[PDB]
Amino acid sequence: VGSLNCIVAVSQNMGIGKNGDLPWPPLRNEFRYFSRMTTTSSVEGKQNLVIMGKKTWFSIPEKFRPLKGRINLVLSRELKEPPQGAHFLSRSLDDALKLTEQPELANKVDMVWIVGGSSVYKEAMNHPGHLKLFVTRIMQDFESDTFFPEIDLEKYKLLPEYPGVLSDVQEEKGIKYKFEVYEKND
Numbered sequence: 631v632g633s634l635n636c637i638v639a640v641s642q643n644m645g646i647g648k649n650g651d652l653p654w655p656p657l658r659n660e661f662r663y664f665s666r667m668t669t670t671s672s673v674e675g676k677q678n679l680v681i682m683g684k685k686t687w688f689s690i691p692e693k694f695r696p697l698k699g700r701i702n703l704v705l706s707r708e709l710k711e712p713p714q715g716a717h718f719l720s721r722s723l724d725d726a727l728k729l730t731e732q733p734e735l736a737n738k739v740d741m742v743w744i745v746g747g748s749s750v751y752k753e754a755m756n757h758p759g760h761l762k763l764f765v766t767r768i769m770q771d772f773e774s775d776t777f778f779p780e781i782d783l784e785k786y787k788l789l790p791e792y793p794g795v796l797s798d799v800q801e802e803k804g805i806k807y808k809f810e811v812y813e814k815n816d
């Protein structure tokens with residue numbers, strides 16, 4: 631199994647969601663960036679795995695579920711089987727990560743991408759080990775009801791460049807944003 635990563639787009643006030651959708655209007659190229667990063671596997675004969683909470687799963691429009699070309703794992707203690715369209719169900723992050731090493735997935739998974747929501751991000755970011763955060767900074771405030779957890783910059787070093795990540799300011803629908811990559815290893 632390859633790298634562990636989180637990916638998120640986040641407003642200035644740390645907002646990631648409102649009423650089960652994004653706090654801001656659709657940003658087509660930003661969605662493209664998400665799809666590119668999570669889908670692109672460095673390793674032949676493997677796919678990336680996406681891990682997400684139950685509400686994050688249901689927040690993705692049905693026509694885009696499962697996230698194509700990726701193995702889709704949902705976290706839930708209430709569900710008894712994976713939602714329609716989902717590939718796997720785990721009762722915890724540690725369980726999901728363990729599963730990735732089992733016979734059914736050991737040979738199949740390249741990178742793993744935590745795609746939300748708040749509680750999965752928090753546990754992942756606070757768990758010792760080698761972890762990257764792909765963070766898109768939406769450079770405005772947006773009314774939100776769910777928030778990205780604090781990034782501890784003592785741990786998470788902002789990388790000065792990363793291959794395939796544009797460094798300049800992007801803009802769609804009058805909203806400026808920029809891409810960042812953070813890395814910790816503890």
Ligand SMILES: NC(=O)C1=CN([C@@H]2O[C@H](COP(=O)(O)OP(=O)(O)OC[C@H]3O[C@@H](n4cnc5c(N)ncnc54)[C@@H](OP(=O)(O)O)[C@@H]3O)[C@@H](O)[C@H]2O)C=CC1
Pocket residue numbers: 637638639640645646647648649650651652682683684685686687689705706707708709720721722723745746747748749750753776
């Ligand atoms: N801007 C961005 O990049 C992103 C935005 N979002 C947005 O953020 C919101 C995210 O939703 P959020 O409210 O944080 O919900 P989550 O997706 O984290 O879902 C919460 C639910 O997932 C299960 N769950 C979460 N963590 C675990 C775990 N470790 N083990 C087992 N089960 C778990 C549910 O449990 P159960 O069935 O057990 O009760 C829990 O109630 C939505 O508005 C979405 O649009 C989401 C991802 C990215």
Ligand SMILES: COc1ccc(OCCCCC(=O)O)cc1Cc1cnc(N)nc1N
Pocket residue numbers: 637638639656660661663664665682686690691694745746764765766
């Ligand atoms: C779970 O997070 C997401 C899952 C899917 C997604 O949309 C991508 C497909 C385009 C579908 C459409 O057009 O409606 C977006 C997210 C959120 C997200 C966005 N951006 C970044 N950088 N990270 C994310 N997690």
